[PDB]
Design a protein around this ligand. Structure first.
Ligand SMILES: [Mg+2]
Ligand SMILES: [Mg+2]
Ligand SMILES: [Mg+2]
Ligand SMILES: [Mg+2]
Ligand SMILES: [Mg+2]
Ligand SMILES: [Mg+2]
Ligand SMILES: [Mg+2]
Ligand SMILES: [Mg+2]
Ligand SMILES: [Mg+2]
Ligand SMILES: [Mg+2]
Ligand SMILES: [Mg+2]
Ligand SMILES: [Mg+2]
Ligand SMILES: [Mg+2]
Ligand SMILES: [Mg+2]
Ligand SMILES: [Mg+2]
Ligand SMILES: [Mg+2]
Ligand SMILES: [Mg+2]
Ligand SMILES: [Mg+2]
Ligand SMILES: [Mg+2]
Ligand SMILES: [Mg+2]
Ligand SMILES: [Mg+2]
Ligand SMILES: [Mg+2]
Ligand SMILES: [Mg+2]
Ligand SMILES: [Mg+2]
Ligand SMILES: [Mg+2]
Ligand SMILES: [Mg+2]
Ligand SMILES: [Mg+2]
Ligand SMILES: [Mg+2]
Ligand SMILES: [Mg+2]
Ligand SMILES: [Mg+2]
Ligand SMILES: [Mg+2]
Ligand SMILES: [Mg+2]
Ligand SMILES: [Mg+2]
Ligand SMILES: [Mg+2]
Ligand SMILES: [Mg+2]
Ligand SMILES: [Mg+2]
Ligand SMILES: [Mg+2]
Ligand SMILES: [Mg+2]
Ligand SMILES: [Mg+2]
Ligand SMILES: [Mg+2]
Ligand SMILES: [Mg+2]
Ligand SMILES: [Mg+2]
Ligand SMILES: [Mg+2]
Ligand SMILES: [Mg+2]
Ligand SMILES: [Mg+2]
Ligand SMILES: [Mg+2]
Ligand SMILES: [Mg+2]
Ligand SMILES: [Mg+2]
Ligand SMILES: [Mg+2]
Ligand SMILES: [Mg+2]
Ligand SMILES: [Mg+2]
Ligand SMILES: [Mg+2]
Ligand SMILES: [Mg+2]
Ligand SMILES: [Mg+2]
Ligand SMILES: [Mg+2]
Ligand SMILES: [Mg+2]
Ligand SMILES: [Mg+2]
Ligand SMILES: [Mg+2]
Ligand SMILES: [Mg+2]
Ligand SMILES: [Mg+2]
Ligand SMILES: [Mg+2]
Ligand SMILES: [Mg+2]
Ligand SMILES: [Mg+2]
Ligand SMILES: [Mg+2]
Ligand SMILES: [Mg+2]
Ligand SMILES: [Mg+2]
Ligand SMILES: [Mg+2]
Ligand SMILES: [Mg+2]
Ligand SMILES: [Mg+2]
Lengths: 130, 252
RNA sequence: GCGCGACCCCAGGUCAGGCGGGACUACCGCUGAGUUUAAGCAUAUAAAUAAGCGGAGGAGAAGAAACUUACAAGGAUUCCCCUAGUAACGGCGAGCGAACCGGGAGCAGCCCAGCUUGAGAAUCGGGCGGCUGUGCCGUCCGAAUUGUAGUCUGGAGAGGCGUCCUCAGCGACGGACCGGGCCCAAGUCCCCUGGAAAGGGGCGCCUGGGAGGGUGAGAGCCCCGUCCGGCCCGGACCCUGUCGCCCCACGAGGCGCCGUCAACGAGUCGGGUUGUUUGGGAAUGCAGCCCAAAUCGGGCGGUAGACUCCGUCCAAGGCUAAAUACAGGCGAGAGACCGAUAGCGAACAAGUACCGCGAGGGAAAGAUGAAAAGGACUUUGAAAAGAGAGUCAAAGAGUGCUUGAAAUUGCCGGGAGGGAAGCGGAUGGGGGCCGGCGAUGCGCCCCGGC
RNA sequence: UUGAAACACGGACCAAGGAGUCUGACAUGCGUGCGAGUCGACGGGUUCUGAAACCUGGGAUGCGCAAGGAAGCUGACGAGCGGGAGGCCCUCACGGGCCGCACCGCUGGCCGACCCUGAUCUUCUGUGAAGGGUUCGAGUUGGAGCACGCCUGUCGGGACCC
RNA sequence: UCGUUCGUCUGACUUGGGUAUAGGGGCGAAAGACUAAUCGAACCAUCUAGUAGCUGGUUCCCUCCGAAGUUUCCCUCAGGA
RNA sequence: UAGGAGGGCGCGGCGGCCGAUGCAAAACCCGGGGCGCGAGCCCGGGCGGAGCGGCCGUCGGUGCAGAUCUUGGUGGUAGUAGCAAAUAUUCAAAUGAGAACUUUGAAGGCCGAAGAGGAGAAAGGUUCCAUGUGAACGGCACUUGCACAUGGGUAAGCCGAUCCUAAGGGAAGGGGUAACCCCGGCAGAUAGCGCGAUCACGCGCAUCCCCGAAAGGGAAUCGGGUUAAGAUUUCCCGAGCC
RNA sequence: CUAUCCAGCGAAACCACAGCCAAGGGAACGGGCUUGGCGGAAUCAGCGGGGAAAGAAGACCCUGUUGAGCUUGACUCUAGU
RNA sequence: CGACUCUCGGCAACGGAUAUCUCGGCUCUCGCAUCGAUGAAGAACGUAGCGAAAUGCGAUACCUGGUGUGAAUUGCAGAAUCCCGUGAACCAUCGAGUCUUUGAACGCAAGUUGCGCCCGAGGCCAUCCGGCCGAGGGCACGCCUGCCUGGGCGUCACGC
């Protein structure tokens, strides 16, 4: 149960916050989980998903399909992954939509900012357990 | 409770006026003007669409009702007694079937516990964990309108833990457990001791708290309670056993 | 053939400045009804209200007794409770209606004018220059003697004397309060169903975290969050907490005595009369006009009057937090509230479309799907479309598309009818439907085994 | 409406909405608590889901505990009778006797307004032994009340709706 | 409004545009005429959900009890005590 | 009957208890079976696709057939009343899916110029012109259009406005006013000073500011050409004028 | 020229349920009730007897302790003079 | 047998009730104190590769700048150097900027983009070492402090 009398526990406000969040806020909301191998290696559970990351679907009808992130299409709360597609009636091919909370990031697109971000998150999870 | 009421001005933001008689329509006030579907439509009536309600609710309803200070204390006394009767604690729905004794008093070593995991062992060593099981298992979404009025989940009641010493930590070991409530000994609440208005809340007393009860409520003697102007209520019937009275030698 | 100085007025696109308008919740001033009630109606009531005209702030207004009381008296203002539906007022009708005492919240008191620089305007503004720069310094003009400063404000005070007792500032680090950014527990393990597992069963784990939300169906462990707190950045602050240097005075203040002085607000008070207002009643406040003061004097003591005594305060100038109010603004948090004819008029390009010359009036209108995967292609047709097909768990969920009632309508099957039909009781014929619609078991017995 | 099948009015049909409520004062009844008391209702303290709960004050706040007078004022000196539920004593028991609650009836005492009365005492205008009354009181000779809750009723409010 | 028929047509004539008068006010060769289809007092918003002893309506079942149109007073006679 | 009371039924929340549901919740549908005197209730079948129910206490914007009730939807009337003023059309051909209604030609008629012709002021605002067009709309129809869609189009020293004053309006100082506002001749160092001068001074100051007319007053233009749509005089050619 | 018939287009008023009469009774003039007369599908064009036909909460009259315009020797006031 | 009318059932229409929702409303509580001549509120017109409305903005016009974050925006198209970095973004936030015409609205007006005056950087010639077109910018009213210019026998002094 909440203690901070500045955070709202109302269904109406919490939904408004979610569905009217700006782009800089959807990056955190559309966050994915590290794989078992990476969670073991970086000591972080989950990260905000990036353009060139590699994922594996773990819940959809496409469960067990791996691929590369090709678009983090924040305006629809979705990511398209390479070759995760279906064909339209006319025969054209379209990329199907995946929510970041139903994939695991099997490989990281690491940068200077990502390395620092992994550090800060790793410094944290240890700072409570120890 | 918080008050609720309609807007004071609602249904009364039109310049509508009755056409009168002679036009083959009822005499309800109507919206004048023209150029829109609103023109000529009824207004201000509780039968009209867009009108104000009959007897609009006001915030100066009587939300809060007063009870005598003494009647509050009498009812708390009755609720406490019923917590000590196994048949009534059973009948009110608590699984009390492996508990050793009623009243259920546990040592003061419980006081210093810290974790929800620590609290779970204590309930297991009593016969208390089964009742806490039922509370957690019974959690579901509230049927009806309340699930969208910020009251989405409901559950059953578990046991109530009463501690005596102020400033303890079992407040924080038990709070994550659905159904389980913690109370301090001096300031007990009737809403916990008889929730739903039904007698028989399952109470786990700490030894620190069970010994303060005689301090708090006193006896059948004047000025013995910590409370002022209070004496425990006496019954209308000293022994309620109709078996013993009806089948005594004196009456037969 | 003057030039003076001051007085009162000019005009300046002179140097520098400040004014007006906007918003309505709450606040200050003015002005000001009637509906209504009195079972009629005129005083009364509605109401010192609505409308009208203005003025402010974050609060505003009030405020430090020309007060109450009649007591062993109390002691600024405001607000709550009580006083109290009371005293009073009232075609004494309908009705109306405070205050003192008492109990709480919060408490805080100040500053002018006047006799009192005269060896000396010691005061203040502006230009210019400089610097440590919300100010200080120099200098030159000017204001002001028809009075700037200092003293002093009735509780006093000026004087006089007197052992005595009291006084200067800037550093340094912070604590609090204020805003912001980040970081932080545990399963997505095995089987089944399903389009989808967030469902069921198995086995586990977190919990100072089972508030809430998202994610393809009731998710603590999938994601954001929540608990405990950690960190980094930036403020305003003028409140206090400690270390450093500087040491407060012959000026002022306190305190002890003295009795010589002892100044205290004028067309104002106060009285008459008129109108309004009030619970205020031989007149509660206010305002017009007339009369018009006093200094052993003035204002009060809720019945007008004269005298004796008694209690009480000192108007006619000014400032002053806190406790209080808050349908507006901005920023939050909640709810036994409403659920698209409800809730604001407006959940939506709603004060919109549209109407009116105008002042103004003022709607209707939410929901495909988990995902557009929104129906390629063939065939008939001028086309719209149809028939096949394709997508989908599903399209019979097909772009006003979740469900999809009634009124009313078409088709198919059945039934009946000589100027209504429907209806209540009877039953007969047809239908249509009902297997808990309706039983086959129990007692003696003889084996042949359990 | 005395009287409706009416040549009385309203009603073409269907869906949805649609009218004795909230509040303040009082009253009777009922329930709860305490009881000559009873209310903690403005505050304060405390309270980690709670605007909740819990504690505190009151030696005088409200109502009650005393009334009659316009007022100045004065302020209940202690009740008998008839009938009575019920209990007890007697009788073989029918019948008798004793005590008798509530309630009904009857007659009184006392307080007060008004009238009447007057020993003694006293601060000379007060007191009041005795003795009163076809008078009047929402009096006393029964302490029963206070708080909360609900229905009903009267009234004020938009006040059942138009 | 239309058809036919009518009145007047150098005049106190017809007419456009500009301008003046605004609600117990205007303007009137006077009809209470006209003042934006509104006139014996326009229109708009508000006071205002104005008041009505008067008309209309007033939403589920069963069971039990069950009336009055008469008295007195009232500017009382369709009302109330 | 009016009226009063009791006991129930039903709707939506809240505190409690007990439960159903993707092996199909709610809602709705039925010539399905039953229970209850009744309010109502239980089950079956179907449709639907994610929520719901019973019991105790408690609470309320809690039960409709009416109100010339409110809003929405729907009938019968009824393929009915009706589409009838302004004299009138006809033949061939083209086009086109389709022609009484479009286009060309021919014929027959009408307005008869105080016009059914050619141009403007007000008012409108793109209706103008070209190209194309599924629906709607053009009260039959349409290939069509004043509709819909996409584009294009308004050229000035000389036409106007602009300048001047009319009736009249606004207005500074001043007068009134609680203030919003109301008063312009009331006469004030009235606003503005004007003119000659500059290389500075002089003179004079009288009835005085602004607004108000695309019909009053008024600097100046004519002819000939040109576009799908602009011009008679805005563009081009020539010739002038202020 | 309509009406009429055809192609195309296509309303509204009104509507408890309806729609053949005679007498009786009845809220004293019935489509429905009582008793009789009768009574046979489905359609077209007209007509104005009836539906006490539609239109409009009678404007006449009365009532109301509802108004308003106007008047005056009504009551109470008031600008002006 | 049929037509018509009425009726029962099944299916199909018509219509939008019901159920289930909800970035909306309503109510209560809390914190704070911030418009304008330095031109506000309000009005108008513009502004995007493809936009009418709403939202945003102002000729620097769905934005410029700084800072934080750290790789998108998205209906289509395009530059993409913008990817271990001065670095994407219909991102957040705010200090630097811009801010058309109006409006208390201010040079006079207004059914007018109408009608004046003043200054003036910049350029041209010489009718001067002045004059011509200027980019930009002023000119409202009342008031206060100072100043400059001036008026009147109002009161004086001193003269002539
Ligand atoms: Mg009608
Ligand atoms: Mg409403
Ligand atoms: Mg007044
Ligand atoms: Mg009123
Ligand atoms: Mg009256
Ligand atoms: Mg009345
Ligand atoms: Mg009257
Ligand atoms: Mg007002
Ligand atoms: Mg103040
Ligand atoms: Mg009282
Ligand atoms: Mg009053
Ligand atoms: Mg987590
Ligand atoms: Mg699972
Ligand atoms: Mg959830
Ligand atoms: Mg977390
Ligand atoms: Mg007076
Ligand atoms: Mg003051
Ligand atoms: Mg609405
Ligand atoms: Mg609406
Ligand atoms: Mg389906
Ligand atoms: Mg569907
Ligand atoms: Mg769904
Ligand atoms: Mg549907
Ligand atoms: Mg149907
Ligand atoms: Mg048939
Ligand atoms: Mg039958
Ligand atoms: Mg049968
Ligand atoms: Mg009658
Ligand atoms: Mg009749
Ligand atoms: Mg009637
Ligand atoms: Mg009718
Ligand atoms: Mg209904
Ligand atoms: Mg008391
Ligand atoms: Mg007795
Ligand atoms: Mg008696
Ligand atoms: Mg009422
Ligand atoms: Mg005629
Ligand atoms: Mg003629
Ligand atoms: Mg003629
Ligand atoms: Mg004319
Ligand atoms: Mg004219
Ligand atoms: Mg006449
Ligand atoms: Mg009403
Ligand atoms: Mg009647
Ligand atoms: Mg409700
Ligand atoms: Mg209702
Ligand atoms: Mg209905
Ligand atoms: Mg009814
Ligand atoms: Mg016809
Ligand atoms: Mg005709
Ligand atoms: Mg002519
Ligand atoms: Mg054209
Ligand atoms: Mg047509
Ligand atoms: Mg002009
Ligand atoms: Mg002209
Ligand atoms: Mg002209
Ligand atoms: Mg030319
Ligand atoms: Mg036809
Ligand atoms: Mg007959
Ligand atoms: Mg009839
Ligand atoms: Mg018959
Ligand atoms: Mg026939
Ligand atoms: Mg016929
Ligand atoms: Mg007829
Ligand atoms: Mg009729
Ligand atoms: Mg009538
Ligand atoms: Mg009467
Ligand atoms: Mg009258
Ligand atoms: Mg008279």
């Amino acid at each position: 149960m909440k203690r901070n009398p500045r955070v709202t526990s109302s269904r109406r406000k919490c939904r408004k916050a979610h569905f009217t969040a700006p782009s800089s806020v959807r990056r955190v909301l559309m966050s994915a989980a590290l794989s078992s191998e990476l969670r073991h290696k970086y000591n972080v559970r989950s990260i905000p998903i990036r353009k060139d990351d590699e994922v594996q679907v773990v819940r959809g009808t496409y469960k067990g399909r791996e691929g590369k992130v090709v678009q983090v299409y924040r305006r629809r709360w979705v990511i398209h992954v390479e070759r995760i597609t279906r064909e339209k009636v006319n025969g054209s091919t379209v990329n199907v939509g995946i929510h970041p909370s139903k994939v695991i990031v099997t490989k990281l697109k690491l940068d200077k900012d990502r390395k620092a971000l992994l550090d800060r998150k790793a410094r944290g999870r240890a700072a409570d357990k120890a | 409770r918080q008050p609720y009421a309609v807007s004071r001005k609602a249904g009364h933001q039109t310049s509508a006026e009755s056409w009168g008689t002679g036009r083959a329509v009822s005499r309800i006030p109507r919206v004048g003007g023209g150029g829109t579907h609103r023109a000529g439509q009824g207004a201000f009536g509780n039968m009209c669409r867009g009108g104000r309600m009959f007897a609009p609710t006001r915030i100066w309803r009587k939300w809060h009702r007063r009870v005598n200070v003494r009647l509050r204390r009498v009812a708390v006394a009755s609720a406490l007694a019923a917590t000590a009767v196994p048949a009534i604690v059973t009948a009110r729905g608590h699984r009390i079937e492996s508990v050793p004794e009623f009243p259920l008093v546990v040592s003061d070593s419980a006081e210093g516990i810290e974790k929800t995991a620590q609290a779970i062992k204590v309930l297991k060593q009593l016969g208390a964990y089964a009742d806490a099981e039922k509370a957690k298992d019974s959690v579901g979404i509230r049927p009806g309108k309340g699930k969208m009025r910020n009251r989405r989940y409901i559950n059953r009641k578990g046991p109530l833990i009463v501690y005596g010493t102020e400033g303890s930590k079992i407040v924080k070991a038990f709070r994550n457990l659905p159904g389980v409530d913690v109370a301090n000994v001096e300031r007990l609440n009737l809403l916990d001791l008889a929730p739903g208005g039904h007698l028989g809340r399952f109470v786990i007393w700490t030894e620190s708290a069970f010994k303060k009860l005689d301090e708090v409520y006193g006896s059948f003697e004047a000025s013995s309670s910590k409370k002022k102007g209070f004496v425990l209520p006496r019954p209308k019937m000293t022994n309620a056993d109709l078996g013993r009275l009806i089948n005594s030698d004196e009456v037969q």
